[PDB]
Structure formats: structure tokens, C-alpha cells
Design a protein around this nucleic acid. Sequence first.
RNA 1: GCCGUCGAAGGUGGGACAAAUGAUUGGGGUGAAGUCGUAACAAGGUAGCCGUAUCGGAAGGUGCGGCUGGAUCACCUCCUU
RNA 2: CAUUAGCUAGUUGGUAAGGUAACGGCUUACCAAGGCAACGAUGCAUAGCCGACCUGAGAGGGUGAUCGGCCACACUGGAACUGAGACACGGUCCAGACUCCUACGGGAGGCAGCAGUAGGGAAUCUUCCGCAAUGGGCGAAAGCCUGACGGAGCAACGCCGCGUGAGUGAUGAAGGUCUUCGGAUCGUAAAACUCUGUUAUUAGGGAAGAACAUAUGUGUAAGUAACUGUGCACAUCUUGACGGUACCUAAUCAGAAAGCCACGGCUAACUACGUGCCAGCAGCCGCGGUAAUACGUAGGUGGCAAGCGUUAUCCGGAAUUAUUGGGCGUAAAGCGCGCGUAGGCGGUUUUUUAAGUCUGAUGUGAAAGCCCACGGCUCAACCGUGGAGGGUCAUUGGAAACUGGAAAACUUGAGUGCAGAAGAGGAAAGUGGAAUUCCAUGUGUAGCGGUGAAAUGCGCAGAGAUAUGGAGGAACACCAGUGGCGAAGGCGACUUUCUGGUCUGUAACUGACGCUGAUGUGCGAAAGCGUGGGGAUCAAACAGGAUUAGAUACCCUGGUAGUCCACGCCGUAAACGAUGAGUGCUAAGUGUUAGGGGGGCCCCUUAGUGCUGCAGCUAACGCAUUAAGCACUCCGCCUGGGGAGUACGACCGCAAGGUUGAAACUCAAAGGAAUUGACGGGGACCCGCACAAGCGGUGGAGCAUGUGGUUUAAUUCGAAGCAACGCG
RNA 3: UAAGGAACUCGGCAAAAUGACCCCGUAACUUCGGGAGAAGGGGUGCUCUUUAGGGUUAACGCCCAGAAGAGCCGCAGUGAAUAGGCCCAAGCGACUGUUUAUCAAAAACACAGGUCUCUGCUAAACCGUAAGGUGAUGUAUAGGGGCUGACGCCUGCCCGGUG
Lengths: 131, 135
Amino acid sequence: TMTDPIADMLTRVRNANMVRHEKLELPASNIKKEIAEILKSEGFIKNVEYVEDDKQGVLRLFLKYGQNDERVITGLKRISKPGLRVYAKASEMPKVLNGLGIALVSTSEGVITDKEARKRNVGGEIIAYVW
Amino acid sequence: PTINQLVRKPRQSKIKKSDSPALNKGFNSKKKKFTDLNSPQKRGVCTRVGTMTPKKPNSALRKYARVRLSNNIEINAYIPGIGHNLQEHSVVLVRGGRVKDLPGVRYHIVRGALDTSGVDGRRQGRSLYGTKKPK
RNA sequence: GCCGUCGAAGGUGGGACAAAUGAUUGGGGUGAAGUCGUAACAAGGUAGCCGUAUCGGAAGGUGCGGCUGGAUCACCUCCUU
RNA sequence: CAUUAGCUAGUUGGUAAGGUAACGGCUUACCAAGGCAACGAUGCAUAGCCGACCUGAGAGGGUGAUCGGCCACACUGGAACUGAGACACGGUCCAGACUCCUACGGGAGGCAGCAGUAGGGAAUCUUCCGCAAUGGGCGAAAGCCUGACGGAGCAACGCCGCGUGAGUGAUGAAGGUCUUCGGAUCGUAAAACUCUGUUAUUAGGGAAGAACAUAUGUGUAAGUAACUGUGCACAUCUUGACGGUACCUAAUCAGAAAGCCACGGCUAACUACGUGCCAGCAGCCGCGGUAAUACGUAGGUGGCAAGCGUUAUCCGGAAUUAUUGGGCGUAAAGCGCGCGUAGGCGGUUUUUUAAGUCUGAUGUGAAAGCCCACGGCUCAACCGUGGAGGGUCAUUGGAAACUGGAAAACUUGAGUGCAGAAGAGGAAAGUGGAAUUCCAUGUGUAGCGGUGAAAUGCGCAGAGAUAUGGAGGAACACCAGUGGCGAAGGCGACUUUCUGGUCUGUAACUGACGCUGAUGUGCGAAAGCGUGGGGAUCAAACAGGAUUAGAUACCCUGGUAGUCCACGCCGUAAACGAUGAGUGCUAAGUGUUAGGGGGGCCCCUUAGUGCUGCAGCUAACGCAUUAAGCACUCCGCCUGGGGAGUACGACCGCAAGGUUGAAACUCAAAGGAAUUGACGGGGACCCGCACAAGCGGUGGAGCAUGUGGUUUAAUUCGAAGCAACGCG
RNA sequence: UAAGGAACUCGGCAAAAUGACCCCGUAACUUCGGGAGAAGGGGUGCUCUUUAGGGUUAACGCCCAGAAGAGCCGCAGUGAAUAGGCCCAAGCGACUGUUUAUCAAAAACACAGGUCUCUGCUAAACCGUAAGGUGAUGUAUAGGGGCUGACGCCUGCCCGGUG
């Protein structure tokens, strides 16, 4: 059965990006909502649309591609998995691709990126690597 | 495996079986027991000196010696060099290192040592094969 | 001074375990181009293999079930253009 | 270490008493039956633990010499006394084993203190000086003791530093070694001149470590009737094992001070000679069989250098146990398949909590170590200071996204309800038709049957054939299909009775009730076993008859168990999609099975089952919405090939046998996919004096010729299938 | 009966030794029942204190048993009589059983279990000349005869000869 809804979300983005689909939809969640808006503000995807249905509303993601159909997102990697969780301190926050990619960290200040997480000097759960 | 499978069954590495086992064992004559020593060399008595035919690809008469070491262990040892003065009841010093051709010879008799002369005409490589500096 | 509870060592007994050794006896490995067959690799002289049982100097064969990790052939059935 | 599964009986708890510095089964009585254990009780083997050391980029892996902290021990084993503290290394008592004395009754001893001896071993040192410093015991102190300690003796055992000479000088002497005989190389290397004294020799100076304690004086403080005396403050006197040792200064001399290993590739360094698969070398690949850069030597070269190599062991390289950081279709690896327990993981929202998580503050993580900085030895090693670092650490605040806990809410997951669908799903009992065999008759006559050919074999006592009838067993033609059902194994004649599962539609209900699943518990093709039946057909084995050189085989003739039923047992298969289960995502095209909804046809759609085929994956073959793609959860399994699925042990079984499952030893391969050829008794299509039709020749005899063989003084040398033999 | 303890002997024949009760322990091997009382250890007298127990009961009292202490005495305490020696390993027979009264008790006979064969009922087989019976008032899961002999694993080859 479904065990990691977030890993399903990143794989949905990975699979759609590989075949260059312009848009995808997935069942929404509060944490899955934030990850989408982090990727929007960081410039990985074009827009996030959240549609209210009766049960677990729909998250519509519009992927961004470049001039020569250059996939803006290169890869996605779930770090903290249900079988083994990963937590990091503010001092040992990882630098994805030497800062050329973001790490999604869920801290006490909400779901944020790894760059300004060192600014707040807080740590949390390393959700995923996006580069 | 999965992390849970690894937690229940931690990874088991392979054990390393060492060559020259007879150099890793000592003896206790008081307790009549074998010990573990890891000796560089062992000293023994030659109970048989002869010549052994080599493996099939090669062909040369190779001198060897059946040596009963300080332990109660009887091993076969090579005799490097050209000439040797060893007969029965000769005390020798035996080091590690096997002979590829000779099946059943896993040791080397150290030349130029206790009751073992060096090579008579050796002039380059006298550290091995015994023999002192000519003139 | 005596005796009495504990009490080391010692003695007796039946078991447990571990090494060494033993007439003799089993299969394995190595070697000297020693003798009989030719079982498999080509449909390898009779497709092979697996499981099983029974026979045979020996590889094995045959009996029942299964697989293609089988040829050629007769065609299925789809695909296909 | 599970091939160590059940351990204990003061055991476990309580109640009293005792005694212990003190709680306590610590001990004893009496009650109860308790206590620990797959989160590894117990047992076996091994081991002092740590700071720390080695290795590694790190994660980790190995180790526990010297220095420091803790523990335990003092010939082996018990016990207490004295004592604050011992059940006591140079204390006591007893027992034991040793060694020594004895007038035989009895006595003495304990180097795992420092040296040292014997022994074992590959291997580890002087039977030294001094309390001069630091520390300790005792004393008011002077002092005494201190094998602690401070120093000396030996050992390249290690690290560090300096040497063994430099400047000019012909890369020409003479000599080696090669040689293409011209030369080249050792080589600026050498003489040759100048030059230095690090070192060395001798011959003069010569530290620090020394602060003292005491004693002496001088003041001060407290307490004093006062003094002595004490604490404190000052300055005087004193002393050194090392040791005339560091160290410095004068002369003198290039003189007294380099060896080891390699040179085939990995891997820096090539020639000649000797030998000739020998002698020998080798870590692997391997070398050596008259022209070895691989063996031995000589020159040269190169790597290091007071060291250089070999051996022994650890980490690395090894991603070769893969947490970082591997895999299971064919290379090793998915359990034969279900049902399921612990455990692991788990759909969306809200509130709360704060165990994890994150962020601070305290305490500690000794010192010595690692790293950084700084200072002192002439530098360095080394030493000393200051930081840093080091924890699944403890206490205490703060945050609340996630994981965890509590309380509520929701349907999509999962189930239930309702309306439908198909099915060789299973069990039991019945009912049929075709066929085989046998039996009884009628007809019937000389064969039947079988092979490549045979024959055994059945017949003439009437076989085979044909017709009728009867007995019995087993299996269900046509339907029948990349068809259906089942978790798998498997399930095909029809009927009835029980009974399991699946699919479609709806959205009526519950609101996460789910997935996977060690141990466990069941099912599980054939063959096999037991009991009792049954026995038509086919038949392992067995008999023959053939083929072959042999044929305990393929061929033929028969033929027993078995094949069938009912109970049990067995629990294995190429039990295969050689592909674990669950969930979601990711181009299409076209079928078939079972439904649904719309406009016989078209479109859409659900679940199966197929064939092509994208992205993507793979070593390739290939897979590809029924993944071997992309992701998450859980389980099983693998770590080169033999030995070997073999011991041995356990467990299961009536047995066969099944499950679990090594090692000694041995090799450098084993293996997968694909490629090029060659082989196929391995087939289709063609050709060729290959076959057929043939006309039309040798091998028998005598002679000639060349050979082989024999012989000889020599019978010269070569040719030995086709492609030597009237050949040179 | 000193000391020795199978040296006697064809052979430990005979004799000697263990023996009761209570407690603790008990192996291999197994057909899982057993082996087993296995082996191998310890105690038992008397008096007193103490004080559980249940049996008849109205209670006294009467019975039959326990436990813990403190003594006492002998050489010895089931103080006499009566009451298993044991263990290791081979054949043979599975076993309990039965046999030569009056020299053989066994390895011989039985046996439960196997197998073959005969027999359809006025059965076969048997006693009788016959009638009458036995078998049996039985009916092929019954009856007679041969052979073998619990159980476990098994039982090869030969049909010429003889039946």
C-alpha cells in the first residue's frame, strides 16, 4: 500500500519531467502543498494550482522547460524515508550541487529551503533534494 | 537489503585465512598445549632432505627439506640457491613464502643462518641467499 | 583443654564434554600421455534437463510427471505492413 | 558461537531473626511459586578495561607495547589476627606440589621488586652510581631509609639531525665493458692544483639543573605577666651522582667514516658472456629446450642510503558485506504456494502534547595524546604553554513542521450492503457413449504380427478376421481456443447436493478497520511406502529375439510392481515468467475473454489474457502500463570454482529419504551474453566420371625399375599419405 | 577361623556376600511401554521438650499418622527370625507358556503374526462296513491341511526333472 505520499509526489514530477509533460495533477496535502510553492519560488516549476474537491483536493503543477526544451528540474531524490528518517542540525545542513540546487527541510519554522534555513540557524527533516 | 533487514542481521564480512599457518602457532611443553604466536620465523630440524619434481608446465629438479618446527608441526620447505649443506638432523630457520610449482611446499629455508650456509658463488643479491661480502 | 557448625585439600561413584590413538574400513584430491567402453557438447549416434524409483563392469538406460535452457517440419493464433 | 534453547531452586517475592561501616537472600527458619529467556536465559570458547595507538578522504576496520586512570593477582588453595585502612608481594596459621638442612625428633624457603642465572623461544639489556633534584616513610630537626626516582652501561630497535668532503679541473690518460672496429661508456669521475675541519685527535677553559631544609641574625603578627617558642617577611652560610659530562676555544689531517636492493610488464634502471625446460628464478602474468634486457656473472643504470631487503601481522587499495556505497530474468542469489503471530511500515484535516527532532544555557567528558598557534633546546626529533576537538551524556528553558502520544472529523484505501456476470475452482453420490482386453458361441482357413531386414512370439488342439452377446477396469473424441478458473500444485463426458473464490455496476453503511510478514501452521505434480480393495490399457524392472566388434541401450515380442480407489505417510520437481508481495506514476497500435454506459456499426470505460512497440533500463540478449522503467514499505536470498549439498550434530519419516549444513585440502580461474571461424551421423537447393549406364584397366606369373628390410669394407645423400617410392 | 581372596576348578559347583523400611540419585538402548529396585550414596536405638494432623464425639476419651529441637547409651540400634548380589558383552530363541511321570526343561514344542493350498455347503477334511455323527446347528471376514514363526527391513535366479 501507499507508504510515502511525498516520495510519490517527487516521482510523479520525475516521471512527467522525463517525458516533458507540461502539467500534472496529484492528490494534495499540506506538506505537499508547501513543497510545490517552494519549487515555484525557487524557479523550478511555473505555477501551482490547488483545486478544492470534496476529498483531498487536487494539486495541479505546471512544469517549466527552457529555450531548447531544457528541463529546469534535473533530478529529485527523497532523503528522509519512512524506513529510515534523516534529521540535520543547522551546522551540518547539506549543500545540494554546491548551492546550484535546493534541499527541502521541514523545520519548526515550516517547510523551507536549506539556504535560508542556515540563516534562521534551525534544523529539521531533510525532505528531498531538488537540482 | 532493507534497513530493517540490516538491523536484524548486520553485515558479516569474510574471514581472512592466512598463508603459512605453521608460523602462527607456538607450543607449551609444560602444559602440552598449542598457542597462538604469529612468529616471523620458526626454527626446526630437517627430518628428510631430498629433491621434488615440479608442476607440469615447468621441469627442474628442486631441492626441498621436510622440517619439524619448534611446534609439533611437520612442514616442507624450499632450499633457495645452488648448493646446500643440509642433511638429516640439521637445524634450520624457516620463513614464509610458498613455491608455486612444488605442491605441498609453503615455506622457505633461510640461507646464511643457524646451521645453513650461503651460496658459495653469490656476488649480487647476497642479502638473500646468504653469503658475506667477498673481500 | 574438650566438642560442634562451616570448612580447603583428599577419597569414593555414576554420568557429560574435549583431544590423541586403534586392527580394519569408506568415499574425495593429486600424479605417471597405464587398460575397457564412448556418456554430454552438432538432433553427439537414442533432444536434453529436473524430481523420483528400479536395474547395470562403468558412463547410464528405462518407467511416470514437468520445462525449453530443442532441430526440422505441418500449421497455428495474433501481430504486422 | 542458535550445529549453545529453555535456565534457577536462595532460585524469586514476603514475614521474622541474626550480622554488616551500610541496604540487601547477605545468612537462617517459615510462608507463597515464584524469577530470567529469540530484545539471545543458560552453556561453550576467548579476553584485563579505558584514555589511547595503527590504518582510512570519510564512514569505518584492526589493536590495548612504553605513559596515565581503574581492576585483579603475588608458588597453588583456604582462613583469620593486628590494624583507620589487609583477609596483606619482601606479615601469620593450615593443606598441597616442589627445593634445602637434620643427631630422624624435627626445621627453612618463595624475584609477576631491581640487576642477574638456567629454560622456552626467531626474539628483548648492567649481578652499575647516587639520594645531587622530585616524591614517599619516620623524626622538632640535623639526619636515616628509598633498585621509587635522577643518571650512567648495552642493543641501528625506532624517529630526528649531521657527516663520510668541497672549488677549478679535458664528457681523452690508464683500465673495465661492449662495439657496426670507426668509436662509445664509466666521466669532471680521476690525477692535478687550491680549500674547509662538520667530524676525528690532543690541550685548555667549563654551565644550568641550586631551590632548599637546618643553623644564624634582623623585624612583624598572634598569644603573652613576661620570656622562650611558632607563623610570616628579609639576607647570610652552605651542597652535584651525572661530571671535568654538555659546550666553547687553539693546532692538525681530506686524511679514519657505504652499503643494500632492482633493471620483461605492473614498476624508475639494458647490454655482453656462461648454461641450455638443466642449473636455476618467481608476488602475479610466467622465464629457462645453443642468439634469456626473466636464470649466474661482468659493466652500466636506477631507487634509497647508515641503512637496504626478506619474512610475520593489521588497515588500504577491496564499492570484494555496498549506512555512506552492491545485487537476485540468463553470471551467486525470489522460499513451490497460501493462512497468518510478533515486529517493521502506514490515507486526509483540526486541536493538544512534547518522547524523537531542532535551538540555547549550565555540569562533566582527568591529565597525558591528535590538530592549530606560540616559546625553548644551534635546527629537527623532543619539550612546555594556550586553544580547539571529542558524548545516542545529565539537568534545565525555548520552537512545534515532521515522526511519536492523546482527543475529534473525513471518505478515495480496505471492507459490508444492493443489482448483475462468467467460469475444466473444490468435495460427495449417481447416469451415459465410443474404444481396449478377456470370455462364450456362428461363419471361417493357413497364416497373423513386426522390422531397415529379421526373428522371438501367437496359430494349425483352428489363430488373425468377421457377427452377436457377456464380464471387468480405466479415460472422457467432436466442443477445444496464446479459451476460462484456481494462491500454487493443478482443474475437461453429463446430472444432482453441499461449497470457495473473482469481475462489473451503484454508492446504501464503517471511517484507515491497511501492507508485508521471522517463528508457526496448512496445501502441495509425478514417483515412492503401509493397510485393504481393484487390476482393462500401458508399462519400470525381467525374459527373450535382433543390431553392433562388444549392446546388461535405442528396434521387436511379452511382461511384474506401478498406473485406479479409500484411508494415512512422504513434502520433493527446469514445483519456471528461471522474474517475491503491496501501492502510485510513465507514448502508443492492434486483438481476445467477462461486464457497464452512450450515439448491426461507432465511441467511451472496468478487470483479465496476448502480440508489436516509444521514453527509460540492461553486459548483451532483451523488458517495456501483465517492466527487467520511475518511486516508497516489508520479507526471503548471494558474496570465486571444486571438495559438497559431502561430513558431523540435530530434527522429521515405517523406509526411501527430507530440512539445516561445514571444514581440512586444492586451482586461478569458474561463469553469463554476444562475435569470427571450424565442426555436425543436420536438413533444404544446385554442381562435379561423385553416383548410374557403361564401354573399357590393375592386384595371379616371369622380367625391369625404385624402395623398405636384411647384408656388406662400403652397399654415398636426400623423397615417406594424398602432394615419397621409372622421385632428384 | 590368622594373612591372601578364585591362585581350586572343565566351570566361582558349593559356600560366602546384598536383602526390610524412609530419603536422595539412576546411563546407554528402546518397539517410547520399558530398561529400573538399574547403577550409586545416607538414615533407622532410647528418653525428653515441642506441636502440627483426620478418625469416630456432646465432650472427656479412644484410634491412626507428622514435623522441629534437646539430650542418653552400646562394638553394633530393620542389635534375634523372616525379606534382590550386581555390572559389561556375545550367541540361541521374540515374549507368558508346554515337553521325555522315573538320567535331557533346552537352542526343542506352542504361540500371536505371515503365506500357500483345498473347500459352494449332505462343503472339504475326519470316525464308522452302514446307519448315525464331528466339522456346525458354522457358510469363504467360515472351515480343513502344508510350511514359516512377535516386530523392523526384506525374500534374488531357474519350470529341464518330479509333483
